[PDB]
């Protein structure tokens, strides 16, 4: 549409990922690969607000972005992920979420949103783009036979509504997570998904700040595949462009001129998975297409890097209380540390296998 949130702005580079990358590049012994690895700190990524403890860091990032803007005569944009629903990740074998529905989860979530709003309100000269709750509403399309998801449905809906309504009041541009081609892109799932997302958009008042949907977050699908990955057999929507081209008209029909952002941070290497559902530290992944608003599609505002490559998806240690056995599959790089922590060997491969090359 006419308003692409990225046009005319400089993206603030995450200081946390820059620090991880600088530390990682020192440990790469080949001096040429080390230089390529170091350059990754200049590629914009999203910062994940996956616990209340990260909210003060957001305040520092907004203040630093505001000052950099004044120093350089630019307008700065900060990219964040809201990721703290109660009973988070209801269909997963393990969740690291700190809030539970049974212990005042919704009230704690609303307080988490209120604290984020209070930070954003203080720096109106900084634009914020937010991805809203990966691995949330997509479960309400396909995973309602998982008891934890059925029990979380009304809380997930109420919490997402609280986030959308309140972040809109401070002018945050929002993209709700919408899974990926191998989750919601199956033709039979498109209409239920369109119905759910349109309902959520309506309940939140149809705010123009609810821009659309984010796809492929923390996943590995191609935007535009040369030929279908074998794991996709049976689904005509074998890449993200097919999924978006099929879903976008259904949202438009309901009155929502929705646009999309697509994660390509770990999409450089295709045909590396044994099954489409394998998501944990997939071995051989490379950095994909760098963030850009030159997307080639009327429906896609930007290619983005949402999941920061190198931060682990989950541990392979079966003694961990956070263990998810998906992280033990053969196509998963092992041994792997705890989710969120730096996985140096995996980063080194992301750099080496980058396509396009770094």
Automatic annotation (TrEMBL):
Its EC number is 3.2.1.-. Residues 311-331 are annotated as: Disordered. The active site is at residues 89, 135, 313. One of its GO terms (cellular component) is extracellular region. Transmembrane segments: none annotated. Substrate binds at residues 48, 50, 180, 183, 219, 279, 307, 311. GO terms for molecular function: cellulose binding; hydrolase activity, hydrolyzing O-glycosyl compounds. Disulfide bonds join 90-149, 280-327. It is an enzyme of class 3 (hydrolase). Keywords: Carbohydrate metabolism, Cellulose degradation, Disulfide bond, Glycosidase, Hydrolase, Polysaccharide degradation, Signal. Residues 314-328 have a biased composition (Polar residues). This is Glucanase. It comes from Phanerodontia chrysosporium (White-rot fungus).
């Amino acid at each position: 549409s006419a308003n692409n949130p990225w046009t005319g702005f400089q993206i603030f580079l995450s200081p946390y990922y820059a620090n991880e990358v600088a530390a990682a590049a020192k440990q790469i012994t080949d001096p040429t690969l080390s230089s390529k690895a170091a350059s990754v700190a200049n590629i914009p990524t999203f910062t994940w607000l996956d616990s209340v403890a990260k909210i003060p860091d957001l305040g520092t990032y907004l203040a630093s972005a505001s000052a950099l803007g004044k120093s350089t005569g630019t307008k700065q944009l900060v990219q964040i992920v809201i990721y703290d629903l109660p009973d988070r990740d209801c269909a997963a074998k393990a969740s690291n979420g700190e809030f539970s529905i049974a212990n005042n989860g919704q009230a704690n979530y609303e307080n988490y949103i209120d604290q984020i709003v209070a930070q954003i309100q203080q720096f109106p000269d900084v634009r914020v783009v937010a991805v809203i709750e990966p691995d949330s509403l997509a479960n309400l399309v396909t995973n309602l036979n998982v008891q934890k998801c059925a029990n979380a449905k009304t809380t997930y809906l109420a919490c997402v509504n609280y986030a959308l309504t309140n972040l809109a009041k401070v002018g945050v541009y929002m993209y709700m997570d919408a899974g990926h081609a191998g989750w919601l892109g199956w033709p039979a799932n498109l209409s239920p998904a369109a119905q759910l997302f349109t309902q959520v958009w309506q309940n939140a008042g149809k705010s123009p700040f609810i821009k659309g949907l984010a796809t492929n977050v923390a996943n590995y699908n191609a935007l535009q595949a040369a030929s279908p990955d074998p794991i996709t057999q049976g689904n005509p929507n074998y890449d993200e462009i097919h999924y978006i081209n099929a879903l976008a008209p259904l949202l438009q029909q309901a009155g929502w001129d929705a646009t999309f952002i697509v994660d390509q941070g770990r999409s450089g290497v295709q045909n590396i998975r044994q099954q489409w559902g394998d998501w944990c530290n997939i071995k051989g992944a490379g950095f994909g297409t760098r963030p850009t608003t030159n997307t080639g599609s009327q429906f896609i505002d930007s290619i983005v890097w949402v999941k920061p490559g190198g931060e682990c998806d989950g541990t392979s240690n079966s003694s961990s209380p956070r263990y998810d056995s998906t992280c033990s599959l053969p196509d998963a790089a092992q041994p792997a540390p705890e989710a969120g922590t730096w996985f140096q060997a995996y980063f080194q491969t992301l750099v080496s296998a980058a396509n396009p090359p770094l």
